């Protein structure tokens, strides 16, 4: 029948292999190789608020998948579906006997659970996540028999099962009814009796701790909570760990086409370093097996790591961003300096600054030439290309910056020889970076000597991540640094063309405050922001794919006009690396959070050999 590996055969407490599998698991066809089972895969994360680094290793189990190459999505944990004429209903279909982590059998209920007693329940989820929102209304989700689930929304919703395999989509199979059901008062009428040990006071507060979510730390801090995962948490993710051990799931609902229940490898073992300099050293000296999530985005680390290939016993490969801007200035549309914003809402002051930059340098300097100057628009390769989003403004044109500056009124100067506004103050923009973001912060640098030529100051405000946050949902920037998506995800990613993420939409975050409330909370966006953010819904519920392309094309030629956010380079080469003895990772597949890479590779098919 089907086959296992030694160390699960060993304990004779399980059941038999045939009866921890699904009737008919799915058969993974592995990237290179047929793989032997065996080995510990010693990988890393930053600290102690890093638990995407978890997922991003062992990979969401949604109910769809990305193909390797992110053109499209298969049924993953569903064996199939269907879609009705129209995109509003979509029934799955489960695979017969799959089972949880404890040997639960896992079924329709479950998925039904998920999304009604805890993704669409108001008092867990005040604002329902939006990966299930159409128009920001909820679909109806019904059982059909006890193996197929139904989602029917109020409108077209084309882009559902791209949603499905993206990690913020996977809520649908993250909650076993069984174990969740024991703390929900809904099933039990005395859940209150669980506060105490779980150190809460209310009942969401309780599911958080023991049930969790995509992004919570609690999802990686507990020995008990059933998944469907290819790893299992045995050493937890804790406040002050130094280290993170997971080990196969023996309900594992997979096989290779040899019939052995996957995964290949046994453990995996994270180490937690808070310190990016000396996650560099250990990965120069091989100490990884994989890292392709942390070191690759910034090219100063490209030459060490490059160099030390044959010392530690790793393969750089090079994977292609889908973000369109490595590091991207969010210009505050809602900065609370009420000079600065008398400017910062007028087009031709946020032209001038890009005018005043130079891209090149930036390139050569701060990205050792491996980047290229450009906005925040889609790349050429993608359908959502603009080549106006992506290209105006890039050439240094530091005479017409001036002049702009000259003609909106900023032409007092100071004792130091900078433009103020007409009524006293340095023309002065406050900018927030990470500090070990060493790339990002050389280009902040840089562009505060170019902008010097302009008579405006850029302060850089330079801090770990959790004052960088903080700075930042405290709307207390003028300009935020970091990467604009978009370059091959912007449907999935469009935060910086519309103000709809709460944390990284930073023309605004009030903006975006207002749109996920609707309008009860934040700041009231201006017209063109309104207007960006009526076609995005009306996007998400296109009735036709033409419709759609016409609706979100729109939004990117908006955006275009108004001109709110400013690219220096586009991404170099995200350099990631892997042991050489590590077998059947994808080295071309692209590297992005939609797609949660490097687990886009398939995780539970890699395997360990020393081969010539
Ligand atoms: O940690 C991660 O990989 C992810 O965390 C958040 O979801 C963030 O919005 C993503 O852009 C990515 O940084």
Same mark, same amino acid.
């Given at each position: *029948?089907?086959?296992?590996?030694?160390?699960?055969?060993?304990?004779?407490?399980?059941?038999?292999? #045939?009866?921890?599998?699904?009737?008919?698991?799915?058969?993974?066809?592995?990237?290179?190789?047929?793989?032997?089972?065996?080995?510990?895969?010693?990988?890393?994360?930053?600290?102690?608020?890093?638990?995407?680094?978890?997922?991003?290793?062992?990979?969401?189990?949604?109910?769809?998948?990305?193909?390797?190459?992110?053109?499209?999505?298969?049924?993953?944990?569903? %064996?199939?579906?269907?879609?009705?004429?129209?995109?509003?209903?979509?029934?799955?279909?489960?695979?017969?006997?799959?089972?949880?982590?404890?040997?639960?059998?896992?079924?329709?209920?479950?998925?039904?659970?998920?999304?009604?007693?805890?993704?669409?329940?108001?008092?867990?989820?005040?604002?329902?996540?939006?990966?299930?929102?159409?128009?920001?209304? &909820?679909?109806?989700?019904?059982?059909?028999?006890?193996?197929?689930?139904?989602? %029917?929304?109020?409108? *077209?919703?084309?882009?559902?099962? %791209?949603?499905? *395999?993206?990690?913020?989509?996977?809520?649908?199979?993250?909650?076993?009814?069984?174990?969740?059901?024991?703390?929900?008062?809904?099933?039990?009428?005395?859940?209150? &009796?669980?506060?105490?040990?779980?150190?809460?006071?209310?009942?969401?507060? =309780?599911?958080? &701790?023991?049930?969790?979510?995509?992004?919570?730390?609690?999802?990686?801090?507990?020995?008990?909570?059933?998944?469907? #995962?290819?790893?299992?948490?045995?050493?937890?993710?804790?406040?002050?760990?130094?280290?993170?051990? !997971?080990?196969?799931?023996?309900?594992?609902?997979?096989?290779?086409?040899?019939?052995?229940?996957?995964?290949?490898?046994?453990?995996?073992?994270? $180490?937690?370093?808070?310190?990016?300099?000396?996650?560099?050293?250990?990965?120069?000296?091989?100490?990884? #097996?994989?890292?392709?999530?942390?070191?690759?985005?910034?090219?100063?680390?490209?030459?060490?790591?490059?160099?030390?290939?044959?010392?530690?016993?790793?393969?750089?490969?090079?994977?292609?961003?889908?973000? $369109?801007?490595?590091?991207?200035?969010?210009?505050?549309?809602?900065?609370?300096?009420?000079?600065?914003?008398?400017?910062?809402?007028?087009?031709?002051?946020?032209?001038?600054?890009?005018?005043?930059?130079?891209?090149?340098?930036?390139?050569?300097?701060?990205?050792?030439?491996?980047?290229?100057?450009? +906005?925040?628009?889609?790349?050429?390769?993608?359908?959502?290309?603009?080549?106006?989003? *992506?290209?105006?403004?890039?050439?240094?044109?530091?005479?017409?910056?001036?002049?702009?500056?000259?003609?909106?009124?900023?032409?007092?100067?100071?004792?130091?020889?900078?433009?103020?506004?007409?009524?006293?103050?340095?023309?002065?923009?406050?900018?927030?970076?990470?500090?070990?973001?060493?790339? !990002?912060?050389?280009?902040?640098?840089?562009?505060?000597?170019?902008?010097?030529?302009?008579?405006?100051?850029?302060?850089?405000?330079?801090?770990?991540?959790?004052?960088?946050?903080?700075?930042?949902?405290?709307?207390?920037?003028?300009?935020?640094?970091?990467?604009?998506?978009?370059? =091959?995800?912007?449907?999935?990613?469009?935060?910086?063309?519309?103000?709809?993420?709460?944390?990284?939409?930073?023309?605004?975050?009030?903006?975006?405050?207002?749109?996920?409330?609707?309008?009860?909370?934040?700041?009231?966006?201006?017209?063109?922001?309104?207007?960006?953010? &009526?076609?995005?819904?009306?996007?998400?519920?296109?009735?036709?794919?033409? +419709?759609?392309?016409?609706?979100?094309?729109?939004?990117?030629?908006? @955006?275009?006009?108004?001109? %709110?956010?400013?690219?220096?380079?586009?991404?170099?080469?995200?350099?990631?690396?892997? @042991?050489?003895? =590590?077998?059947?990772?994808?080295?071309?597949?692209?590297?992005?959070?939609?797609?949660?890479?490097?687990?886009?590779?398939?995780?539970?098919?890699?395997?360990?050999?020393?081969?010539?």
């Amino acid at each position: *029948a089907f086959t296992q590996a030694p160390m699960l055969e060993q304990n004779k407490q399980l059941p038999p292999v #045939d009866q921890r599998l699904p009737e008919k698991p799915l058969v993974i066809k592995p990237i290179a190789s047929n793989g032997v089972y065996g080995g510990t895969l010693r990988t890393v994360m930053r600290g102690n608020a890093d638990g995407n680094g978890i997922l991003r290793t062992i990979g969401p189990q949604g109910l769809t998948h990305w193909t390797q190459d992110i053109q499209t999505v298969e049924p993953y944990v569903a %064996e199939s579906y269907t879609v009705s004429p129209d995109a509003m209903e979509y029934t799955f279909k489960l695979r017969k006997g799959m089972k949880w982590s404890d040997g639960t059998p896992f079924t329709a209920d479950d998925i039904v659970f998920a999304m009604n007693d805890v993704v669409l329940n108001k008092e867990m989820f005040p604002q329902t996540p939006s990966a299930y929102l159409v128009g920001g209304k &909820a679909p109806k989700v019904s059982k059909v028999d006890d193996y197929t689930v139904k989602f %029917e929304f109020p409108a *077209a919703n084309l882009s559902f099962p %791209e949603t499905l *395999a993206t990690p913020l989509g996977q809520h649908p199979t993250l909650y076993q009814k069984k174990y969740c059901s024991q703390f929900h008062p809904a099933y039990n009428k005395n859940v209150q &009796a669980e506060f105490t040990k779980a150190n809460v006071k209310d009942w969401p507060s =309780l599911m958080r &701790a023991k049930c969790s979510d995509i992004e919570l730390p609690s999802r990686w801090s507990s020995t008990e909570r059933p998944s469907i #995962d290819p790893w299992l948490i045995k050493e937890p993710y804790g406040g002050a760990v130094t280290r993170v051990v !997971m080990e196969r799931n023996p309900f594992y609902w997979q096989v290779d086409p040899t019939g052995k229940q996957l995964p290949y490898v046994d453990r995996i073992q994270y $180490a937690v370093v808070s310190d990016l300099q000396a996650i560099i050293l250990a990965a120069t000296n091989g100490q990884y #097996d994989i890292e392709a999530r942390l070191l690759g985005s910034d090219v100063t680390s490209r030459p060490l790591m490059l160099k030390n290939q044959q010392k530690g016993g790793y393969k750089v490969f090079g994977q292609t961003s889908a973000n $369109a801007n490595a590091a991207g200035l969010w210009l505050n549309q809602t900065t609370k300096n009420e000079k600065l914003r008398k400017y910062m809402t007028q087009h031709d002051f946020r032209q001038a600054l890009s005018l005043a930059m130079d891209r090149d340098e930036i390139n050569k300097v701060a990205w050792l030439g491996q980047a290229a100057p450009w +906005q925040s628009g889609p790349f050429k390769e993608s359908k959502w290309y603009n080549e106006k989003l *992506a290209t105006q403004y890039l050439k240094l044109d530091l005479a017409q910056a001036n002049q702009i500056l000259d003609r909106l009124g900023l032409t007092k100067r100071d004792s130091d020889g900078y433009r103020t506004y007409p009524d006293g103050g340095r023309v002065s923009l406050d900018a927030i970076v990470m500090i070990d973001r060493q790339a !990002m912060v050389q280009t902040l640098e840089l562009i505060r000597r170019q902008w010097q030529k302009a008579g405006v100051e850029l302060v850089i405000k330079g801090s770990e991540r959790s004052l960088f946050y903080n700075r930042a949902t405290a709307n207390d920037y003028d300009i935020s640094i970091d990467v604009f998506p978009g370059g =091959l995800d912007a449907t999935l990613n469009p935060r910086a063309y519309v103000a709809v993420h709460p944390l990284e939409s930073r023309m605004s975050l009030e903006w975006a405050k207002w749109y996920l409330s609707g309008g009860k909370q934040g700041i009231e966006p201006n017209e063109s922001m309104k207007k960006r953010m &009526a076609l995005y819904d009306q996007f998400v519920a296109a009735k036709t794919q033409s +419709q759609a392309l016409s609706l979100f094309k729109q939004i990117l030629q908006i @955006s275009a006009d108004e001109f %709110e956010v400013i690219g220096t380079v586009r991404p170099a080469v995200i350099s990631s690396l892997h @042991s050489l003895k =590590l077998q059947n990772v994808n080295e071309k597949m692209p590297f992005g959070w939609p797609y949660a890479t490097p687990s886009l590779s398939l995780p539970q098919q890699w395997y360990f050999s020393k081969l010539e």
